[PDB]
């Protein structure tokens, strides 16, 4: 028979559950209902709740179209014992607990493909990339102090001053054939910076021609300096908090400033991988684990937790759905372990080929790339660079005061150098 059950877990946008309509009593249109069991009657096991839910998402719709692809009906129900699955005491739990104990024959959800979960339960072709990701409230903002020199590169600035030296040293050549070099530097330079200052102009007719062909250069200099200026004085270079998993901070949390509060959700594949690859990290991070992703988000916003490690796809989804773009994954979406969301199957079953072809037909005809944007998209998904419509504080405009202070001190250095020599 083609009728086979489907089991899932209420979590992530892939599995979002909705209740029944008060007036209709049924799920909405194009909705396959769901099933769940409840435990009551004190110590004994009571009858199941048999509340029929409406649980859908980016995986459930794929289940719909593969159901029409292979022409099979099904029903949906949820795991009650366990969430993801751990081979605790040699017994699988959650998703794998259901699959190895049969009575499911299928499993659709955010189940991570890995060797441990595959040795007993083979997986189909993954339909979306995922893995491990670290997301933090990585947001400081550091305007580079030399943002007022950025409009030109150092090569151009230095060539500007060597020209100002070799033009003022000829305008006291085209003018000797009381206007010395000390006043041609002070003229030729007061034209570059608008024409604010009081200068002492030449008097020969061929030297005013040179001051003019230099004032045109000043006009182009200030036209091409100030072209981008209020976008260089507002451009903040955010510094990422943690370079990666293998950084010196995570290796030795203790020998630094008070260690980063980083954790995960225990009894999951993310903790499963980290305990194997980094047991020393696992020993410390066991104390910072939290029940769910919502708890992690609240902890990060409140500041008690300052880093979170979890599945890549879910964290990527939660990044774009935040009040502001404060929370962002480390590495601009960097994944330290590439896996995929597969469909759990019983070993040596002929449905695997059908499922693989049904999944790949979506890649081929490209009818789910629009489904990618239908749900997994947020406001923060398109950051508006670092420039905005913001005032200029003293934080922004403080490479000009450093230069003014540096000359405020070099003038005194050369003052004493005069008064002794």
């Amino acid at each position: 028979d083609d009728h086979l059950s489907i089991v899932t877990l209420e979590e992530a946008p892939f599995v979002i559950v909705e209740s029944v309509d008060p007036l209709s009593g049924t799920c909405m249109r194009n909705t396959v209902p769901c099933q769940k069991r409840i435990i009551s009657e004190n110590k004994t096991d009571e009858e199941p709740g048999y509340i029929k839910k409406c649980c859908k998402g980016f995986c459930i719709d794929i289940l719909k179209k593969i159901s029409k692809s292979v022409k099979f009906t099904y029903d949906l129900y949820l795991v009650t014992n366990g969430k993801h699955g751990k081979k605790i005491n040699g017994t699988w739990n959650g998703m794998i607990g259901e699959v190895v104990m049969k009575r499911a024959y299928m499993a659709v959800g955010s189940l991570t493909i890995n060797e441990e979960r595959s040795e007993v339960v083979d997986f189909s072709v993954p339909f979306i990339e995922t893995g491990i990701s670290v997301m933090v409230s990585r947001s400081n903002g550091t305007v580079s102090p030399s943002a007022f020199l950025e409009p030109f590169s150092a090569d151009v600035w230095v060539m500007m001053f060597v020209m100002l030296l070799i033009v003022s040293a000829v305008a006291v050549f085209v003018f000797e054939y009381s206007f010395t070099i000390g006043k041609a530097i002070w003229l030729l330079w007061g034209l570059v910076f608008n024409n604010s200052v009081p200068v002492q102009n030449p008097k020969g007719t061929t030297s005013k021609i040179m001051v003019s062909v230099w004032a045109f250069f000043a006009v182009i200099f200030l036209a091409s300096y100030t072209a981008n200026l209020a976008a260089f004085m507002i451009q903040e270079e955010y510094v990422d908090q943690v370079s990666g998993l293998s950084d010196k901070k995570f290796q030795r949390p203790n020998d630094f400033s008070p260690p980063f509060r980083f954790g995960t959700v225990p009894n999951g594949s993310t903790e499963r991988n980290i305990r194997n690859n980094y047991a020393e990290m696992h020993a410390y991070m066991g104390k910072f684990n939290q029940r769910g992703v919502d708890d992690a988000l609240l902890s990060l916003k409140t500041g008690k937790l300052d880093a979170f490690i979890y599945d890549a796809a879910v964290l990527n989804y939660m990044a774009g759905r935040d009040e502001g773009c404060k929370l962002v994954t480390i590495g601009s979406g960097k994944v330290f372990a590439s896996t995929g969301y597969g469909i759990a199957i019983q070993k040596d079953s002929g449905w695997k080929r059908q499922v693989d072809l049904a999944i790949l037909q979506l890649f081929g005809d490209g009818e789910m790339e629009e489904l990618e944007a239908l749900w997994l998209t947020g406001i923060c998904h398109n950051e508006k660079n670092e420039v905005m419509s913001s005032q200029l504080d003293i934080d922004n405009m403080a490479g000009v005061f450093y230069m003014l202070g540096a000359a405020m001190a070099l003038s005194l250095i050369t003052f004493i150098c005069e008064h002794l020599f």
Partner: protein, 426 residues
Amino acid sequence: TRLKIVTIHQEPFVYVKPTMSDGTCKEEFTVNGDPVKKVICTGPNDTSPGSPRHTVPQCCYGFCIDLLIKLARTMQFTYEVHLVADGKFGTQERVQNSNKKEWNGMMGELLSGQADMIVAPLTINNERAQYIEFSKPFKYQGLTILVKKEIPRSTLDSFMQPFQSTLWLLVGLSVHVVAVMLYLLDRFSTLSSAMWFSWGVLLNSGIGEGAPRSFSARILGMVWAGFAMIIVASYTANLAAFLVLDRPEERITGINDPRLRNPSDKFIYATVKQSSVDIYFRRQVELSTMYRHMEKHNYESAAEAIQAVRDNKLHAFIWDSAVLEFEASQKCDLVTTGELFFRSGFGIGMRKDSPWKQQVSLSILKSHENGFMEDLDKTWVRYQECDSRSNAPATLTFENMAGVFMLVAGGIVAGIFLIFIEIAYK
């Protein structure tokens, strides 16, 4: 012969105004000297009658009214107009937890036999076409989005804005420090003519011709000229970036914005309760998720919804283009943006057994081909009071440059004091 007609109030189509004197309103003429035809409307004093539940004989006029009069002369029938009490277009609901489904608004009365002809901007829809048969659309349109635009959040209410107030101080304090070092590096290698160089290099007023004399102070004066240029050029460039904000943030482009997918505290949007847009929202697959949001923000009618959009009470509104476009043309503060989604026009619904579907459809098609309602479009909604200011840099009005006038004025009134001080100084 005798026909009963229900109509809803819609500003670009149905102008409703309570009658005065004996119960007949004026005969005011259009701009081109043409009379504004009126019809009697025994309509409720206020929407959802309640305590003032009185059928005032108001007068109605507009696009649909002129279409009614044209069909009245063509078809040779008598008619009366009375507004719907609930003030809704119509949706399908149930009461008393019963299997049967009951209609609202127009179909809550037309289906009951209380109305024979429906003349209102009623959008054609599946649930609407199941119970009554619509004629050909007399005006094809699609849903659109009206934004607030009351504050584009880049409003120069002050010309001191480009810099923040702990940088104005530190620019106006770094003038005196550099002056009192130009003076000292020159004295020990005048004070008024150092303090004048220091300023008249910043403002570019070219006032005060004293230049630092000694080689120590020419370095500091040179670098202060550089500092003055960078300060003033940053003020200028940042003021421009405030004014060249003619492209305001990210405008919603149709029903595509991710912010529409997910409800948020800042972003609020809704439509009229029991309207076509509600059916579209519940009728879209992805739109069931945020259906929770506007259910608490939905307005009873579009008039107060648009009033909320004008004020800081609603950000984005969704409604038929033929209404939102007209409202955006009458008021400069409100404009519409985004592609027209749900390109479903209006229409005239008919009863299943009404022997007028074919002939009324032919009548409206005839009105299309002869250009009668093209003339109605030019007469009723073609004012275009606003301008296509989008993709066009704005012009800085007065009250948009009033601060500089107050600056120079206050400089005068301070000068008349400073002159007393100066004459007293000597």
